[PDB]
Design a binder for this molecule. Structure first.
Ligand code: YED
Ligand code: CA
Ligand code: CA
Ligand code: ZN
Length: 367
């Protein structure tokens, strides 16, 4: 039936700034929040402010040296940390900005708090749109991600769940989460992403895990222009097969919105309905679910996507006419919640989609 939803948000998150021209805009989390408050969704869910995750919490995965560096580095002392910055991959893609460590603490606090709430059976679904920073590595920042809140949230879930399923619908391969759990069968990682001359360069369908983790890493590489119909015809069958074979007792769904049509960095052609169809599919399995954010660089579309996905999590129909909000002008010229796909060519032929699905089904038979 309808589910209890716990949502994590800190009013300060929107003030963190990556720098002039950087595509990652934490302000998009504030726009999402303001939009869902104006739709009245606060009436249907419990809103929590996450705690700031500590160094102890972060070192359940990350190295002590890397976390000590993140806690120390500031724009005023960068000159003294030149060598350290290069070692930890902090610089241009992952800049040093005012309050960087606090931003990591808030993003992580929401994911970990959500996992705790699910473990305690106090909620059916936990939502943290400030989370989903899937590229961060044990001792290195990557692709705008510094602390891997997902890996930390999964490790929390593993205290009470023998098998955890991770699903990543961000346009980028969730390399950091895959790497952390590559040699274990206690976490199955499933990533759908653009592959071929595209960041981070990983996620080939032949990357299937290693040792005890062999067959517990699933990658669906895609080309430019995938649309709602093509994505929907592959997502439901793959996830259904994964659920049948793997039988997880908890799920983590990374909802990176950069897979939408018109994204600044992405080259997919999904609409908000096409993207949210994934949430709907995962929700039908009735398992404890942690929903996270991630990418999304055309910020009006990110707010639309995550507001609709929160409404989907709540089983609450919301009108297409956007209600007035603090960021109403960002939603012009239509002021509608839903988006139209572009006329871009879908390079993912129906035969290519079926072939990759068939190849992944062969791997799933090995479970
Ligand atoms: C200016 C920073 C980099 C020097 C530059 N990155 C980008 O163009 C851009 C960043 C960038 C673009 N502009 O202006 C057009 C910037 C302006 C200032 C700072 C950074 C950027 N980076 C990339 O696309 C990707 C990262 C994508 C991360 C997605 C994260 C997620 O999956 O969605 C989850 C949260 N990285 C790159 O392309 C980097 C590293 C590999 C080699 C090529 N790269 C780049 O040319
Ligand atoms: Ca992905
Ligand atoms: Ca694995
Ligand atoms: Zn992304």
């Amino acid at each position: 039936g309808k589910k209890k939803v716990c949502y994590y948000y800190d009013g300060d998150i929107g003030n963190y700034y990556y720098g002039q021209g950087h595509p990652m805009k934490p302000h998009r989390i504030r726009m999402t929040h303001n939009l869902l408050l104006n739709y009245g969704l606060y009436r249907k869910m419990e809103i929590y402010r996450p705690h700031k995750a500590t160094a102890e919490e972060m070192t359940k995965y990350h190295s002590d040296e890397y976390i000590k560096f993140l806690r120390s580095i500031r724009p005023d002392n960068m000159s003294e940390y030149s060598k350290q910055m290069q070692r930890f991959n902090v610089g241009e893609d992952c800049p040093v900005f005012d309050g960087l460590f606090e931003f990591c603490q808030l993003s992580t606090g929401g994911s970990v708090a959500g996992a705790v709430k699910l473990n305690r059976q106090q909620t059916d679904m936990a939502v943290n749109w400030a989370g989903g920073l899937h590229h961060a590595k044990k001792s290195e920042a990557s692709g705008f991600c510094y602390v891997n809140d997902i890996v930390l949230a999964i490790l929390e879930l593993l205290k009470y769940h023998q098998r955890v399923l991770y699903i990543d619908i961000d346009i980028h391969h969730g390399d950091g989460v895959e790497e952390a759990f590559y040699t274990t069968d206690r976490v199955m990682t499933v990533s759908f992403h653009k592959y071929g001359e595209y960041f981070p360069g990983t996620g080939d369908l032949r990357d299937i895990g290693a040792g005890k983790g062999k067959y517990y890493a699933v990658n669906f590489p895609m080309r430019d222009g995938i649309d709602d119909e093509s994505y929907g015809q592959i997502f439901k069958p793959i996830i259904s097969k994964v659920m049948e074979m793997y039988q997880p007792s908890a799920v983590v769904l990374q909802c990176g919105a950069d897979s939408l049509s018109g994204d600044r960095l992405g080259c997919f052609n999904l609409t908000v309905k096409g993207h949210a169809k994934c949430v709907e599919v995962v929700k039908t399995f009735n398992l404890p679910l942690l929903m996270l954010g991630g990418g999304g660089y055309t910020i009006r579309n990110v707010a639309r996507c995550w507001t609709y996905e929160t409404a989907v999590a709540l089983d609450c129909e919301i009108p297409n006419e956007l209600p007035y909000n603090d960021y109403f002008e960002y939603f012009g010229p239509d002021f509608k919640l839903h988006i139209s796909p572009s006329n871009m060519t879908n390079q993912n032929t129906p035969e290519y989609m079926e072939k990759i699905k068939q190849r992944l089904f062969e791997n799933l038979r090995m479970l």
